[PDB]
Structures are given as C-alpha cells and as structure tokens.
C-alpha cells in the first residue's frame, strides 16, 4: 500500500553508482553482443540491494586494510578490511566486499597511510589492475602497483582512494577498461558467487537506458565511458522507501517541470533497470531541469511510446 | 506529504558532508571558544541548501575547470567552472562555487586532464593551500602546487579529485588543518559573502552534537578530525522531502533496533544543526545498528534528558 516513486532529481544532480563521479547524460544502445551484469548500482524497486551494492557513493571503488610489501618490487598486497575497518568475512553471501570494482581495467588513485603511534602519514600513487591474477577481493587480498619499494609500514591503517583509469598508449586506443567484463573476484581460485543477474531487454524493440558518466583518465588513451543501470540516488531512495512493487514494471515519464511537457517514457523494471523503445546507439538530448516521474504500474504487455 | 522525518541510516552508513569520506562516530564538546561556521553540510530541515552546500557527496572539495601556468612553474591556476562544467558566474549569491572547501588547510589530491582532440590523458599529484592569497574560488580562480612544470595543456577539461590533508612535520604536530577557520573565498581582496550563519547552543547546558570522520593524511602530522553538523544523507533527504518545520526544534531519539531501547535524545534545530544536554568533550559509544528517529515537534524551551 505504500506508494512507489522515484526522486525528483535532474540527471546532473545525480551520481554514477559504479564509480564516484556525477552523471552526465542518458544513453541508449543495443546490448545483445555482450553481457550486461554490473554488480554495483543494483537494487530492486522495493529496496533490496543486490550484487556488491552499498549505499554511499564515496565508498565505490575504495579499499581499506593493511599492506605487505612484495620484495624486489614496488608492489603491495592489501589484506582487506570491511569499509568500516571491521574484520572482513569471506563467508558472507556477497560476490566481494561491497563497493569492489565490477569491471576489468586499471584504476589509478592514491594509497594513504597513518602510523598509529605518532600520527605520521604518507601517500603514494597506486594502480589496481582488476584483471590481475592477484586481484582477489572476495578472498580479502588485492595487489597494488605503487611508486615506492619502502615507504609503507606493516599493520597500519591504509586506504586506496580511486581517481581514474589508464590505458597503455602503445596499444589500440580505448581498448581498456572493459566496463562490461566482470573481474574474477577470487583471483580465479574459484568462480564468482552471489552475483546480481545479467540484464537484457526482453520486449520487442526495446533497449536498455544507461545512466552515463565519463571517468577521469590518468594516462594513455582509456575508454572513459561508464554506464550504470540505476543512479546511486535511486538505490539510496528505494532502500529508504521500500515501497512494494504492484507489478513487475513501473512506467516513468521524463518531464520538463517548467512546461509539464513529457519528453519520453520508459520502463523501470522491478529487479532494477530501465528500458526504452528505440533502435540504435544514441545520446538523449534533454532539458537540464528534466526529471523522472513515476506515473503507473503496468502489466507485462505495455508498449512504450517510441523514441529516437 | 508525510510528516517530517530523518532517514533510517546508521552512523557508518552515512557520509561526511565536508569531505567525501564516511562518518565514523558521534562527538560532543563545548564550542563557546571558537566560531563554528562550516559552509558545506548546511541545510534547513525543510530542504533549503545553505552556504556552499550541494547534493553530491562526490563533489565535496572537488574542482573543475581549465588550467594555465607561468612558464617553468609547477603551480597551475585553474579557471573554475561549475560542477557540471557550466560557466561559473561570480555574481551568484553564494560564498563560492558549490562544494568548495570550507576550512583553511592543505588538501592533497590529483589533477587529471583529457585532451579533447585525441582522448590522451594525464594525472599529477596536486595540493591546494586554501589559506593562500591565490585561493580565490569566489572570483573563479584557485592555484594548485603540482609535481609537473610542463605536462598540462591549456583550455582542456581538468579536474581536481581530493584525497586527504597534509601538515609540515618540521612544525608543531597537528597544527593544521584548522577545520573551524573559513578560507577567504575572494583572496586577500574582500570579505566573505552569503555565508551560512555561525551556530551555537543557546539552551543552558546544551552542546552541539558533531558527526565526525577522520580525513586521510598524505604527509606530515595533520589534524585529521573533521566534524560536520549534518550527514550528507540528511541534506539529501531534507532537500527531497521538503517537509515544513512545525516548530523551531524537532526532537529526535537515537534507537537501538537490536533492543528497541532509546539510547539518547537530541534537538534537531530547523536551521540545520543538532544539540544534546551534556557538559564535556566525549565520544558517544553506540550500537553499530543504532539510528536516529523523529519523535515530535517541540517548543523553544524543551529540556532534553541529560546524557554523559
């Protein structure tokens, strides 16, 4: 009986749920050629978090723990803690710690550390390759490449803050990251577990609607496109509201609040993704003050007004 | 049009509104001796954002713009844009661009840049000294100290991502940052404008309640304590709900959902800060699952149950 709704927020007011950066635009494209199975930004419309999804956007692609130096290298193994520094439990029924990256690529950021006895601190450039054999966050271990072979201490609180992505400029431009390729969360010690399911439009003539950002690039010629299935604020809002789904499909209209004019309509599926009636790869051009409005639950046969 | 409320979120599920990091604890202490006037994390209970507050946790202490430098210099001046890359208008009735840092200190992070013709990218260590004469975000310009004297291009999209704070280890430990000292947003040039007001308890025996985090340290012996008056999620929630204030004070109770018991009560003032009945500098020790819950609107001279 509690009524469903989505937040009154513009696209630019919202945040990507797969990296800590604002949304920029709405994009639609076919996706039959590849598997769409992101693990961050996954939530049902009645507020059940899925995959590796957690609530605050600043924890997305962050890691915390302590580090051990790999002798003869500038590499360090982080022994992960949970996002609140609690001991990490690998038997929890999740694919990896909440907020773990859900794509294969090279994420550059900064490893910072505090020494607890005296409050001394340090920071160094660091990169995590999430396709590495040594990317094993589900087992509590992640390897970082850094610019030091000596400065970090053992058993001291250490954090990785993500900044952006890189690419090898001597190879084909934009060939990485690969945002729809999941990592092996156990570094191939075993298969991935407890995943949010892959998504695909099932209705004739429909495509996914993607909430898109441009990740910062730190070196090379990376593919900076990053698409999420739900804005982080929608995850946060559905978790709070926990309104029951009266059918499997919520009908949303995208509206200009100055005029009341509806720009387009789309389907928000109960399991947490959006489709539109469109064929082709296109950016939507929108009014900056436009926002989504929930109008009606609809049945499995409802045909959207075509766009594009 | 529901009654006024606060979100059902634990302390650790929420985010500092003054730096993009999680909350860690609740802290109370006297503040009669200094000025408490932060500009981020400022919002009335009915959803009016104040100061430099905006909605995105990830934009707090971020800057966007393009950069120039004097030939041979490691210091780059950024000509600021708005957070969505729009032109920045210095005649807007705000203290500085939304999300500008609201304390004097040295914030270290990374300046990233993309060259639009070919998608080439670059990233460099960067520090902004918010006490500098060259820190003039209200005028549209700030300077970054970087580790390059040649590797940024003019007129290209450039972003500063914050990571943590630093201190000069050759001087008294923890002497900076100074979290309650506001920068001069227009440089040495003129006084600050359009500030969210200073806050103080007015009821006898009351103190402010602070939502506290520890900022990452990147070098030296910084003071990493960071207190905000409202979690970022409460700013987001009040903006979204916009419930009118029925008196000047909302009584909240902190509830342990493990037991049903109320641990303490506090006053949420309609202008956006919290007070408790206590004398002393003390950390609150809480159940991890504890959360705040609205109980009722109260008159101006309600007396809280004492704590501590």
């Amino acid at each position, epitope marked *: 009986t509690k009524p469903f709704s989505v937040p009154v927020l513009t696209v630019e007011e919202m945040t990507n749920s797969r990296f800590p950066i604002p949304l920029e635009k709405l994009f639609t494209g076919p996706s039959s050629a590849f598997v769409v199975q992101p693990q961050n930004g996954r939530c049902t419309t009645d507020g059940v978090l899925l995959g590796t999804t957690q609530l605050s956007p600043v924890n997305i692609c962050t890691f915390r723990g302590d580090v051990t130096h790999i002798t003869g290298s500038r590499n360090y193994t982080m022994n992960l803690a949970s996002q609140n520094w609690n001991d990490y439990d690998p038997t929890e029924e999740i694919p990896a710690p909440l907020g773990t990256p859900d794509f294969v690529g090279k994420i550059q950021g900064v490893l910072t550390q505090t020494t607890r006895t005296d409050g001394s601190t340090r920071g160094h450039k660091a990169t995590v390759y999430t396709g590495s054999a040594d990317f094993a966050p589900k087992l509590g271990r992640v390897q970082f490449e850094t610019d030091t072979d000596r400065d970090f201490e053992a058993n001291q609180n250490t954090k990785f803050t993500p900044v952006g992505v890189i690419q090898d400029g001597g190879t084909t431009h934009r060939n990485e990251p690969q945002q729809w390729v999941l990592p092996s969360y156990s570094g191939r010690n075993t298969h991935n577990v407890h995943l949010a399911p892959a998504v695909a439009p099932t209705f004739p003539g429909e495509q996914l609607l993607f909430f898109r950002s441009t990740m910062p690039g730190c070196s090379g010629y990376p593919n900076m496109d990053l698409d999420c299935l739900l804005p982080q604020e929608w995850v946060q809002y559905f978790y709070q509201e926990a309104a029951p789904a009266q059918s499997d499909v919520a009908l949303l209209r995208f509206v200009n609040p100055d005029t009341g004019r509806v720009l387009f309509e789309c389907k928000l599926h109960k399991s947490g993704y959006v489709t539109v009636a469109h064929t082709g790869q*296109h*950016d939507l*051009v929108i009014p900056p003050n436009g926002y989504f409005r929930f109008d009606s639950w609809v049945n499995q046969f409802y045909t959207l007004a075509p766009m*594009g | 049009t529901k009654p006024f409320s606060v979100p059902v979120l634990t302390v650790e599920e929420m985010t500092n509104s003054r730096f993009p990091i999680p909350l860690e604890k609740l802290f109370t202490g006297p503040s009669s001796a200094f000025v408490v006037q932060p500009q981020n994390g400022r919002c009335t209970t009915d959803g009016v954002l104040l100061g430099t507050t905006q909605l995105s946790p990830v934009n707090i202490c971020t800057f966007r713009g393009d950069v120039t430098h004097i030939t041979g210099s490691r210091n780059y001046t950024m000509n600021l*844009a708005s957070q969505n890359w729009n032109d920045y208008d210095p005649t807007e009735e705000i203290p500085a661009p939304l999300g500008t840092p609201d304390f004097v200190g040295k914030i270290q992070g990374v300046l990233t840049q993309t060259t639009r013709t070919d998608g080439s990218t670059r990233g460099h260590k960067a520090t902004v000294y918010t006490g500098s004469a060259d820190f003039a975000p209200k005028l549209g310009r700030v300077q970054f100290e970087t580790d390059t004297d040649r590797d940024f291009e003019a*007129n290209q*999209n*450039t972003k500063f991502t914050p990571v943590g704070v630093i201190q000069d280890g050759g001087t008294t430990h923890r002497n900076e940052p100074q979290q309650w000292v506001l920068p001069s947003y227009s440089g040495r040039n003129t006084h600050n404008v359009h500030l969210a007001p200073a806050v103080a308890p007015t009821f006898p025996g009351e103190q402010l309640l602070f939502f506290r985090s520890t900022m990452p340290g990147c070098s030296g012996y910084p003071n990493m304590d960071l207190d905000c008056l409202l979690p970022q999620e409460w700013v987001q929630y009040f903006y979204q709900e916009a419930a009118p204030a029925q008196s000047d004070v909302a009584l909240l109770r902190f509830v342990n959902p493990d037991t049903g018991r109320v641990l303490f009560e506090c006053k949420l003032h309609k202008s956006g800060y919290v007070t408790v009945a206590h004398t002393g500098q003390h950390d609150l020790v809480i159940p991890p699952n504890g959360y705040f819950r609205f109980d009722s609107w109260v008159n101006q001279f309600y007396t809280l149950a004492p704590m501590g």
Partner: nanobody
Amino acid sequence: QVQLQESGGGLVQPGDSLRLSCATSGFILGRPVITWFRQAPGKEREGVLCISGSDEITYFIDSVKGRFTISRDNAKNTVYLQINSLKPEDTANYYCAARTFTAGCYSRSIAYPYWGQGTQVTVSS
C-alpha cells in the same frame, strides 16, 4: 556514437560571404545546444556564438554581431554560420561544439563534450 562535422571553409575574398555547416548525428529527442568556436593563429579556441535547442541565440564576441548569423535546420540535423562581408580579422580555424542539453549557451570550451575536427577560413591577401 555522436559525430559533428564542419564544412564550408576555404581561402575566401574580403567582402564576399560564406556559409559554414555543422552536421550532426548520434542524438535523439531534444535539439542540442550548438556553439561555433574559432582558433586564430597563436590563440586558443574561443567561443563565438551559440544557438539553444529553442533557437535562442547568444553572442560571445560583440564585434561579430553585425555580420555573423547562426541558424538551425532541424530537418537536416545541421547548424549554420553565415558570415557577410568577410574581413581579414575573420581568419581562423572554425569548430562546432555540442552539448547533450537543450539549454545552456556557454562560452568556454570545457562546457562542450562533443567537437568537430574544424574547417579553416582564410580571408586572402
């Protein structure tokens, strides 16, 4: 996959007129803000004038307002820049740039995610 492509430049005669076109593909729904920039020798790309999705026009350089006209042809997904009475000061590489919004005419290059490769205008000696 958005694409912008400018055409219409060349070595042109003072006092003649010309028409640049900015052809776009890859957008749906609203009509995008489009702005013409130019880069004169030794300078950065500078914003000249802009047309919103509602065809509201903003000039960023006051000296061009007598002679430069921007317009939109929705049916051919093109925006034009017509220049009357060409003058040597008009000489530059001309770029069009687009935003995925119907409103917001901004003067700075960083406000635009999408760009063409440019067309050169040289008012000949």
